[PDB]
Amino acid sequence: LGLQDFDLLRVIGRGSYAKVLLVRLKKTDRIYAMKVVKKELVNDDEDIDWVQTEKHVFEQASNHPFLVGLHSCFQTESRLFFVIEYVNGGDLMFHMQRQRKLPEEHARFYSAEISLALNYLHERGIIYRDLKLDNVLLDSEGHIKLTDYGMCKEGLRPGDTTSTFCGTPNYIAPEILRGEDYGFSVDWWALGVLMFEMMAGRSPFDQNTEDYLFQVILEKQIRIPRSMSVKAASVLKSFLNKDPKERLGCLPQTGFADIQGHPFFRNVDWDMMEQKQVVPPFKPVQLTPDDDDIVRKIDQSEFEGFEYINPL
Ligand SMILES: CN(C)CCCn1cc(C2=C(c3c[nH]c4ccccc34)C(=O)NC2=O)c2ccccc21
C-alpha cells in the first residue's frame, strides 16, 4: 500500500514519537486508525527493536478479540505507518473521569476481558508491560481492547525473565523497582491497579513524584475501601501482593486457572466471554512536506521488511 490509496480523514492522537490518524482505505472503503512515526525519530539499534517489537506483537493481536489488529505497514523517506484495526469507544481513562467509581460488577466484566487479553499475550511469550487506563479502549458497543505495544517484551518461554526497568510509573510493579529480573507477573500487578482504580476511583498509592511514589508502592500497605466487598478486596490483595510469587495469576502452570478460579470471578463463564457472548454493562488533513535538510540525512538502511500486509 501507500499514502495514495488512503483518505487521511483526521488526526485523533498527537504525540512526540507518533501521530494516530483516522484514515480510510479507498479500495475497501473501510476504516483503520493509522499510526505515523517520523523516521527521523527512530535512529540507533535500540529503536528498530521498539518498532519490530510493536510489529511482532501487532502480528498477533489480530488473532485475539480484545487485542487490536494490524491491517498493514508501510513507510516513506520521512516516516513509518501502521494501518491498524480501529476502535471508537474511548479509553477507560476518560470513561472513568466521567463517572468516578465503577460498580463492582461492571469492573469485573472489564478486568475479565483484559485478563483474557493478557493471557493470550503471555501464552504467546509476550509481556504487555504498558497497561494503564487510557490504553484499554472501548469496543463500539462495550468489549475492551488492549492497545499500544511499544513496551512489550518479545518471544519468551514460561519460566524466562527479562529486566528492562520501564512502564508507566503509577502501575510499575514492585519487583521492577527492586531491579530484580521479572516476567508475566508485572502484567498482573498492573491489572491489580487498573482494577483498584476502576472500583475505588482512586489510585492505590499516595521528596517528589517518582522519588516518593516508588517508596509508597514498596512499603505503603494499600488501603482498601471499607465499602468494598470481601471478594472485591481479596482480588485486589491477591493482585497487589508485592511478592511476584505469592501473587494471583503469578503462580506457574496455574496462574490463569487461579485467576479464573478466584471468587471475584464466581459466575463468569470464560469460554463464553472469550467469544464476546457476554453482554457489556455499558455500550458506548495533509501531513507536513519532507524536510530534505533532515530526510537527506536518514539511513533508510535500517528500514527493510517494514512493509507487511496482514493476509488474514
Ligand atoms: C490516551 N490515549 C487515547 C492513548 C492512545 C492509545 N492508543 C490507541 C491506539 C488505537 C486507536 C485509537 C482510537 N481512538 C484514538 C484516539 C487517539 C489515538 C489513538 C486512538 C485505534 O483505533 N486503534 C488503535 O490501536 C493506539 C495505537 C498505537 C499506540 C497507542 C494507541
Curated annotation (Swiss-Prot):
Effect of residue 26 to W: Abolishes activity
Amino-acid positions noted as binding ATP in the UniProt annotation, renumbered to this chain: 12-20, 35
Domain AGC-kinase C-terminal span(s) in chain numbering: 266-312
Keyword hit for Cytoplasm: yes
The reaction(s) this protein catalyses: L-seryl-[protein] + ATP = O-phospho-L-seryl-[protein] + ADP + H(+); L-threonyl-[protein] + ATP = O-phospho-L-threonyl-[protein] + ADP + H(+)
PTM statement from Swiss-Prot or TrEMBL: Phosphorylation at Thr-164 in the activation loop is not mandatory for activation. Upon neuronal growth factor (NGF) stimulation, phosphorylated by SRC at Tyr-17, Tyr-32 and Tyr-86. Phosphorylation at Tyr-17 facilitates binding to KPNB1/importin-beta regulating entry of PRKCI into the nucleus. Phosphorylation on Tyr-86 is important for NF-kappa-B stimulation. Phosphorylated at Thr-288 during the initial phase of long term potentiation.
Regulation of this protein's activity per its record: Atypical PKCs (PRKCI and PRKCZ) exhibit an elevated basal enzymatic activity (that may be due to the interaction with SMG1 or SQSTM1) and are not regulated by diacylglycerol, phosphatidylserine, phorbol esters or calcium ions. Two specific sites, Thr-164 (activation loop of the kinase domain) and Thr-288 (turn motif), need to be phosphorylated for its full activation. Might also be a target for novel lipid activators that are elevated during nutrient-stimulated insulin secretion.
Main location: cytoplasm
Positions of the catalytic residues: 130
A Gene Ontology molecular function term of the record: protein serine kinase activity
Entry EC no(s): 2.7.11.13
Tissue specificity annotation: Predominantly expressed in lung and brain, but also expressed at lower levels in many tissues including pancreatic islets. Highly expressed in non-small cell lung cancers.
Listed result of changing residue 26 to R: No effect on activity
Annotated localization: Cytoplasm; Membrane; Endosome; Nucleus
Alphabetical UniProt keywords: Acetylation, ATP-binding, Cytoplasm, Endosome, Kinase, Membrane, Metal-binding, Nucleotide-binding, Nucleus, Phosphoprotein, Proto-oncogene, Serine/threonine-protein kinase, Transferase, Tumor suppressor, Zinc, Zinc-finger
Primary role: Calcium- and diacylglycerol-independent serine/ threonine-protein kinase that plays a general protective role against apoptotic stimuli, is involved in NF-kappa-B activation, cell survival, differentiation and polarity, and contributes to the regulation of microtubule dynamics in the early secretory pathway. Is necessary for BCR-ABL oncogene-mediated resistance to apoptotic drug in leukemia cells, protecting leukemia cells against drug-induced apoptosis. In cultured neurons, prevents amyloid beta protein-induced apoptosis by interrupting cell death process at a very early step.
Family: Belongs to the protein kinase superfamily. AGC Ser/Thr protein kinase family. PKC subfamily.
Notes concerning its domains: The PB1 domain mediates interaction with SQSTM1.
Subunit structure: Forms a complex with SQSTM1 and MP2K5. Interacts directly with SQSTM1. Interacts with IKBKB. Interacts with PARD6A, PARD6B and PARD6G. Part of a quaternary complex containing aPKC, PARD3, a PARD6 protein (PARD6A, PARD6B or PARD6G) and a GTPase protein (CDC42 or RAC1). Part of a complex with LLGL1 and PARD6B. Interacts with ADAP1/CENTA1. Interaction with SMG1, through the ZN-finger domain, activates the kinase activity. Interacts with CDK7. Forms a complex with RAB2A and GAPDH involved in recruitment onto the membrane of vesicular tubular clusters (VTCs).
Name of the featured protein: Protein kinase C iota type
Species per Swiss-Prot/TrEMBL record: Homo sapiens (Human)
Lineage of source species: Eukaryota, Metazoa, Chordata, Craniata, Vertebrata
